[PDB]
């Protein structure tokens, strides 16, 4: 019963290792191998996989896919799903050539949705990103219309937040192991701000003495990289976000000095 659900999954892994260790370039992979690739490494959902399986029978074909072929033959109506595929292929063609970061699904569309986006203090958009199959590679390519229309970010500041988020991954060379490692190296010390999750930034606000106020920066898009990289983002704009009335002078004065320390060290 499930014995045959395990065997066939093994086989799919076997086809891939057979290929990446026979050295072959993408445009020479056979159908079955390419189909394994879509499932295991791209994290493609079964419905999309089945479409490609029935219309794309070789790497040769796979590699040459135009947007309209994907659109009319494969029958993928959402432009973001299409871009997903093109970009994956684009990456695999380089990666497999005679010419001397690599994505094996490390930063696929579920890490992006369930881990990264909340890490940026943007958990409210999670579902739309998921529903669009947005992975790390696509992030760099999303336009403003993409973010408004397809991903529902009507807030321009949240778009800025995402941007800096991406600017972080860029500088980290998209290396997921190194992100998580740096993030936890700085849970109780006060050093590598570039990385800090919206969570780290909350708990920090509590540590300088603002336990009441912190919780308000939950779905605000406040995070380490914005703090570390945006010159516009100073204490004044952080206070505005924390919703501190102008009357409360001492809290502001607290944040102003501790924030500058945070920036200095």
């Amino acid at each position: 019963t499930q014995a045959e659900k395990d065997r066939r999954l093994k086989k799919k892994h076997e086809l891939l290792e057979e290929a990446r260790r026979k050295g072959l370039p993408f445009a020479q992979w056979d159908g079955p191998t390419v189909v394994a690739w879509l499932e295991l490494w791209l994290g493609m959902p079964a419905w999309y996989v089945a479409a490609c399986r029935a219309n794309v029978k070789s790497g040769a074909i796979m590699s040459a896919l135009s947007d309209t072929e994907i659109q009319r033959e494969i029958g993928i109506s959402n432009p973001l799903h299409r871009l997903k595929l093109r970009l994956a292929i684009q990456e695999m063609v380089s990666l497999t050539s005679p010419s001397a970061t690599l994505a094996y699904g490390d930063m696929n569309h579920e890490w992006i949705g369930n881990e990264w986006l909340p890490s940026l203090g943007l958990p409210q958009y999670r579902s739309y990103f998921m529903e669009c199959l947005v992975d790390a590679r696509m992030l760099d390519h999303l336009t403003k219309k993409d973010l408004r229309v397809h991903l529902k970010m009507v807030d321009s500041f949240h778009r800025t937040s995402l941007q800096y988020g991406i600017m972080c991954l860029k500088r980290l060379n998209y290396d997921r192991k190194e992100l998580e490692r740096r993030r936890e190296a700085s849970q109780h010390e006060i050093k590598d701000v570039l990385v800090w999750s919206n969570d780290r930034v909350i708990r920090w606000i509590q540590a300088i003495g603002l336990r009441e106020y912190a919780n308000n920066i939950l779905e605000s898009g406040v995070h380490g990289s914005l703090i570390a990289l945006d010159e516009n983002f100073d204490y004044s704009s952080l206070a505005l976000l924390l919703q501190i009335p102008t009357q409360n002078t001492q809290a502001r004065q607290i944040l102003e000095r501790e924030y500058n320390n945070l920036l200095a060290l």
Binding site: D30, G31, K57, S58, R72, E73, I74
Partner: protein, 252 residues
């Protein structure tokens, strides 16, 4: 000569030719093998009471054959052989008609368009399929097992081989090239190696039509073209490209 054979030697040959139904009627009408030859075309059709047209032609052919006295190869293949062969060329929907008309190797050789129309074979494509299959028999001196040999799979590294591929083999071929979902559409379609390889009018588009691959599935047809061409060879590829320059017009 058949003319010197006894009534019984003639009777059993006649019955061996699948014509034993006319026996208990024309047994008194036949003393000698010579009396079979003496009889003009109409004497036999009256006296033996042969009423099916194909059956007349069959005897006619068979008689004029023994008269030459030379031993034709197509003539060596009886009707059961031909009816097996319909499985091989991809047209088993006709075995009833062919077997009932006792189509042998001679009748294959002297096949006319109305003959095939009478056997309810009416498809232009099936006439092509048969015409090219007979070519393959000619190429093989009408050796009984020329198709009914299957060699090994790898054996195809020379396209000549493909010439002798049956309908089953072509389907086995599609499965090896990831077109398993389509391979059964070729059942009863008369598609075989002889036709793929030798008919310049038969190409990728014909193949893809027969397989039910819509014109809009470009990516699938592309795959198919790539494999079809590797199958048929360089020359056969060139032959078919060349024919495209001279359209097969219906009315000159």
């Amino acid at each position: 000569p058949f003319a010197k054979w006894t009534k019984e030697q003639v009777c059993s040959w006649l019955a061996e030719q699948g014509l034993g139904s006319y026996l208990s009627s024309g047994k008194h009408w036949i003393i000698s093998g010579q009396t079979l030859l003496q009889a003009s075309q109409q004497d036999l059709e009256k006296e033996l009471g042969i009423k099916h047209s194909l059956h007349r032609k069959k005897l006619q052919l068979a008689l004029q054959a023994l008269g030459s006295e030379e031993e034709t190869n197509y003539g060596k293949l009886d009707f059961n052989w031909v009816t097996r062969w319909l499985d091989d060329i991809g047209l088993p929907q006709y075995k009833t008609q062919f077997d009932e008309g006792r189509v042998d190797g001679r009748m294959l050789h002297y096949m006319t368009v109305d003959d095939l129309l009478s056997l309810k074979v009416v498809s232009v494509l099936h006439h092509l399929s048969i015409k090219r299959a007979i070519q393959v028999l000619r190429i093989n001196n009408f050796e009984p097992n020329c198709l009914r040999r299957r060699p090994s799979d790898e054996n195809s590294i020379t396209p000549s081989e493909v010439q002798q591929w049956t309908n089953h083999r072509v389907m086995e071929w599609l499965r090896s090239v990831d077109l398993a979902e389509y391979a059964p559409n070729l059942r009863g379609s008369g598609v075989h190696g002889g036709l793929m390889v030798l008919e310049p009018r038969f190409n990728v588009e014909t193949m893809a039509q027969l397989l039910n691959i819509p014109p809009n599935k470009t990516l699938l047809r592309r795959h198919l073209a790539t494999h079809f061409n590797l199958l048929i060879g360089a020359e056969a590829q060139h032959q078919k490209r060349d024919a495209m320059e001279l359209p097969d017009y219906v009315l000159l």
